[PDB]
Design an enzyme around this catalytic site. Sequence first.
Site, PDB file in Angstrom:
ATOM      1  N   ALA A 101      -0.583  45.329  29.318  1.00 30.29           N
ATOM      2  CA  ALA A 101       0.752  45.387  29.893  1.00 30.29           C
ATOM      3  C   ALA A 101       1.806  44.923  28.889  1.00 30.29           C
ATOM      4  CB  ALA A 101       0.816  44.520  31.146  1.00 30.29           C
ATOM      5  N   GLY A 127      -4.966  44.696  29.542  1.00 30.33           N
ATOM      6  CA  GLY A 127      -4.861  45.872  30.388  1.00 30.33           C
ATOM      7  C   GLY A 127      -5.516  47.092  29.766  1.00 30.33           C
ATOM      8  N   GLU A 145      -9.115  46.904  30.646  1.00 28.80           N
ATOM      9  CA  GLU A 145      -9.222  47.055  32.089  1.00 28.80           C
ATOM     10  C   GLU A 145      -9.219  48.537  32.479  1.00 28.80           C
ATOM     11  OE1 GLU A 145      -5.910  44.158  32.865  1.00 28.80           O
ATOM     12  OE2 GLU A 145      -7.442  43.061  33.989  1.00 28.80           O
ATOM     13  N   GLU A 164      -6.027  37.653  28.083  1.00 27.78           N
ATOM     14  CA  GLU A 164      -5.008  37.210  29.029  1.00 27.78           C
ATOM     15  C   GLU A 164      -4.859  35.697  29.123  1.00 27.78           C
ATOM     16  OE1 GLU A 164      -6.668  39.907  29.283  1.00 27.78           O
ATOM     17  OE2 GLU A 164      -5.847  41.368  30.706  1.00 27.78           O
TER      18      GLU A 164
END
Lengths: 263, 262, 264, 264, 263, 261
Positions: A68, A113, A116, A137
């Site tokens: 992100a 992300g 992910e 993260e």
Amino acid sequence: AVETKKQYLTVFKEDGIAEIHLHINKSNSYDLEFYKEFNAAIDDIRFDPDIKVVIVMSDVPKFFSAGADINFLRSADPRFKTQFCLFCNETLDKIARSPQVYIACLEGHTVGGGLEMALACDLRFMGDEAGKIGLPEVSLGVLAGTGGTQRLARLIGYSRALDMNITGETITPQEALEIGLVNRVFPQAETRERTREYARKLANSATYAVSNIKLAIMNGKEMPLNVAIRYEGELQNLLFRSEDAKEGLSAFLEKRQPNWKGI
Amino acid sequence: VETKKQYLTVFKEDGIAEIHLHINKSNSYDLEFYKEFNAAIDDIRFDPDIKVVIVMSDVPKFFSAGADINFLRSADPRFKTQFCLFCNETLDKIARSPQVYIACLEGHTVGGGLEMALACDLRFMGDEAGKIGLPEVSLGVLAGTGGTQRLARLIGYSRALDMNITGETITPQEALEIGLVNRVFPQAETRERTREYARKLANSATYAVSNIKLAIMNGKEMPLNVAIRYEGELQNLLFRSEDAKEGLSAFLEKRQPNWKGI
Amino acid sequence: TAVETKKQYLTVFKEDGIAEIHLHINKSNSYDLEFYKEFNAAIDDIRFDPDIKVVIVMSDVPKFFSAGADINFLRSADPRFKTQFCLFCNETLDKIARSPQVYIACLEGHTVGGGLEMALACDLRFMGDEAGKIGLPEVSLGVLAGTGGTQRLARLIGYSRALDMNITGETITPQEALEIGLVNRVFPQAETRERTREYARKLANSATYAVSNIKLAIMNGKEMPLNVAIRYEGELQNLLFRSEDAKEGLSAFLEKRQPNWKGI
Amino acid sequence: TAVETKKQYLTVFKEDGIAEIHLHINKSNSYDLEFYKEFNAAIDDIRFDPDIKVVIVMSDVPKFFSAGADINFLRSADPRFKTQFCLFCNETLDKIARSPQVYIACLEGHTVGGGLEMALACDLRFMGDEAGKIGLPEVSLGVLAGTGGTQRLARLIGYSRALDMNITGETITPQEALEIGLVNRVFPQAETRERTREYARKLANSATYAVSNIKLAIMNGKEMPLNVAIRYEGELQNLLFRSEDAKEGLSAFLEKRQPNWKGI
Amino acid sequence: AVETKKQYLTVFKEDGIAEIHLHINKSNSYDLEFYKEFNAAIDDIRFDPDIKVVIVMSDVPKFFSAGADINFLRSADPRFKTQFCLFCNETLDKIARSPQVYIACLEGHTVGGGLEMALACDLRFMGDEAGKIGLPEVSLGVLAGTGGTQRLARLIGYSRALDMNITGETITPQEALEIGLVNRVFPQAETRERTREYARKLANSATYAVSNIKLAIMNGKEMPLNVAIRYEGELQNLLFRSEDAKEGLSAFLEKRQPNWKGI
Amino acid sequence: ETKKQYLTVFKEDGIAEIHLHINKSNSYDLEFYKEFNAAIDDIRFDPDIKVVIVMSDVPKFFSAGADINFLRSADPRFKTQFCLFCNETLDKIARSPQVYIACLEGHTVGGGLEMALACDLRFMGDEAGKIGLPEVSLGVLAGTGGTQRLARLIGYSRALDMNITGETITPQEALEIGLVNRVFPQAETRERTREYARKLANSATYAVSNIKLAIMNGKEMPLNVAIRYEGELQNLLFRSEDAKEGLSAFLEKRQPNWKGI
């Protein structure tokens, strides 16, 4: 043939294979607008009877995706972040329910992300020099909230996943291969062609069965064994009534090549 | 001691029953075979003397190639459904039986053949036994006898997905590395080394072995907090057993335990 | 500065966000009910101590981490007492997965039976390359790994592999343990405590609230179906988005400077 | 007028898509292992008969549907035998929920212990208003409802109500059974069989492929987490959308005419 | 903001309450386009921090909804139908993950896909003259394929749900209330008002607690109890950190009226 | 009789009675739960206790929940641990051999109902007052199992309706939705509750115990394996003294002499 370009993403469709190319920015750091396009692509591909396999790759050098966009996350109300995370998760969740087999072609850094998104795919192929893969993260005071903590635990083991998630350390493609984080490690300048070759081999086979097999495993894993086999059995029932199943059992019994139709 | 059926034979001796498969050249089964297999499982269940069951093939290059493709050809789709259900429920029975089931793989173990092996508690394969996997997709169908589900749970869903959709089979060595089999023995020693393992079990605290097998195979399907409750009741049965009294003593008296399996 | 509290079966040391539970029961650390009553108290104590973010469980006994339950104590007990003894031990071990702190088992000696079961209940397991044997030999006594062993081993290394180890009762080496995923790290024997503490130090010095919520997300989320597991993960993330460390963590990253974690 | 196949402890009748399994073991329909082998065989036979859409289980013994297991048979068996006996009975009952036929238990007499357990394993339960008693009195014998009784009752009427009924061993009336959801219908004693058959005929004369897949969807889907249970429901629906009856059913509706069901 | 419209549906936002008024057809039989609008309405409301409750109602007389359009369904090919059903299902699945409490105001017939939508909502209020409610899909040779068989089984019991699904028989509002198919039965004329009154009370209370309570129960019911309570605990942790908890808590000690702010 | 600060435990004829005498509205704090937990552990290790009844010595309250004064003081992190401990204590009931019966003679709301919910059975008086979860009126939820146990007991939609409005209901209404197992005339609630318990303690208590465990823990399992759990509990019963005494008495039609083993 039939390639629809978008702002942060482009979709190419050909010979039963759809390629979703990512080109958000220099590190492919996404925001809520990118996922809106990604979700629209899955819907579009789902409704396209021709596509049997979807390969997700990056057009950005040295990066598949870094996750992100931190800058986008800064001026984010907490409640907005919640709905932003919820939408990204639900979008990723859709892949496991889709008839096509999704393959993540990792040629660059796949972290946060980025990983992910790959974990949400059915398979992951990576270049022997793609760089780092993992979930950092924790170094930002947050966790991999796009299914990363849950999918990694299920993919490589809850203890190994916990180690990686709490230290936030990234590993090599070779290391990802041995712990099952990825399914294949190909020579770097040979990653795309080897991925496409795999996808091509799927598109040219009994695709209705490959799809049902994909659904059986991906959604059956969430079920107690005794009823998961019931689900597997209904997917088989559909195959037993398909044209390819008849053509397949015949060709085999006639020592001839099967003429797959996908139905 | 010996009970020969048309497609299978069962040998009972020293707490160990061996089911020998002899259906045809590739051991491709039909519904009749499974009825015999089911009968063997029931017969062995009601024989309190058998503690371990070894499933092996008397056919050279095959453990089992799976379902007789010809037998399923043009069979009514509703029939196939019921055929598969019966085969599945039969295999499901192994995980609920008190005996530890061991698949002795000396020949190709593919399709329905692997599915039968996957339903066993353990799998031992010879280093030159051939291939093992699920090639069903090459016929336009899938591993519908628990193959997609048990493989996913045994070796991982992503790895199982890859194998199932490509339908490609792997080697015993590769199988060992991913956990698809528990042991890889020298081809020529596979049968004796399997019997050796089975003998050690049959000569030990077999009630414990049995309850351990049940705890793990059925407990894996429960949420952890209640699975330990299940494990607990199986432990309660062992605490009240004769072998438990003997085991705790024999250990404190630094001696050899005299197991009774009770 | 550094506080230390002791009992007869174990001692708890607290310092800079890390707590070490040292086991000193006997020659092989074979435990009884009283031991678990103390271990349970240590867990509760540590839980109510906001400053502790990591817990290392280690042994002060030469060749053993722990050989499991004391057979002398175990036997000589009524079947109903054994049932309650086991239930209490299990519930005690169950508390770790629910705790905010990351629990690490520092294995420097034999880790078998109940000893391994205690280690399996921790979040991570680090073992010395000369630590000895690790496994579940309960079957040799006519019983099974009744303190979560059969269940946690199966979930950690695979059901068939766990079945094999449990029914034979055979123990393996630290190296073999590492290859099947039984332990997370194998360190040179004389550096085991050192490297384990170094790992814990790094955790204690980072965004411990994130570390803690991550541990909760995985240990408890693995028991839920995927579609709702991510919901549990999402609520834990919500708490993190509302913390100060998150604010600090994101700023430090954009402002390219070392973040100063407060743990909240 | 139904096709009839008689066994030693039961008789199976077949007619117009409906099979009826009549129980006639003895004065109280108390069963042994032999009965269950015949019951299991009947289930398999019916499963392989594509013409049968519904199965009705009823008793030919006046005041009893079934009082459960024959206590005489049960008292003389080795505990290891009892274990295998119960395991076989349970697996036999489990097969009903996986079968394409809708199973209806027609209760005209006492339905207790293993008798109720067998009924609980069926998809539906219809009882006459003078059928007598229904419940699980196993506790009064020092044992419990080991043929799925504790589990299916808990899931059907709620775990607390099921617990209460199990620990006390007290039976209730058909009307009380109806209100707690233990049975689906209470018919006048005199016409309990005809009305059960009437319900069965309506099913057998409808879109049976849809009825069957619906029964499978609910009975097996209830064991799955909701997000994937609907995936299972979806594949069963996919089978119907490709059925001959779906094409006809949709057409008949649009043409405001009566559907011509084929069951395929 | 305003009360924005669309083709088959219109959303009205006011004082923490959004009303989704359905006006698709004379029987409100839907197609894919409708669900697309419904999905969009759900997303828009999610990202609107001021909406606490969502009321779904019909503008069409005598019908809340009669389900999917049989013409749209009949002529579609199997593969399209599959994707169509999958999309509708994923749309309904979103309600349970949304922060708002969803209330279905049933004033007309609620059958087939119509009931399935109501089932996906958190609550159902129906008028005592609303008509019929049930799943008659079987009379068409198909089943309640959009969560119908599954949610009905979980809501009123698997055996009762089975009985209703295989006979396709519909029931009255009173009978529905008795089996728990609906939460309330209001006098036909006082339905929209009493439903709004209930919705008003919710929107004027500790709205953050209400949202988390809804999330706790709807998602927690899919988890084994021991961990379902952990999920409940994290949602509670958020409440313990909210301003309303501090408000309502002290206000309670000060025998005073709580001033909720939704955070 | 064994007396404690916030509660008292009475043991006799196989029945243990935990009387709550905390305060005005039996509104608890952490110390109370530490005593309740200790009581559960003590009873667990007492092979003589077969049934446990939880009742209140306070007139109009069974329990009103967590003490709000004791709570407000707490830091968010303390509250988490406070709740975690309470939850774990209530979880222990479903794993204990005894059958727990909550005797509701007064108001049972919030943490009070959450405690009652963790018990196996709930008997309430027709003039006992209100029952429900009003936590929402405080800006928080029934965080000690309330939202989850209620949903599973009375249905998720009905529980959702009750939790978000914080509305409490009467004993009669509780009985109707299955919130409670019985409703007795106020004056004879304790008496009738003790009769029920007494009948339990005098029967095949090992069976009663394994039945309670089979149901409470098996409900968290998939049916196909839940029946396996039920089966092992049954294996223990088939090997007990009572099973033999129970099977005999029936065939010899004579009242069985239970021993609880």
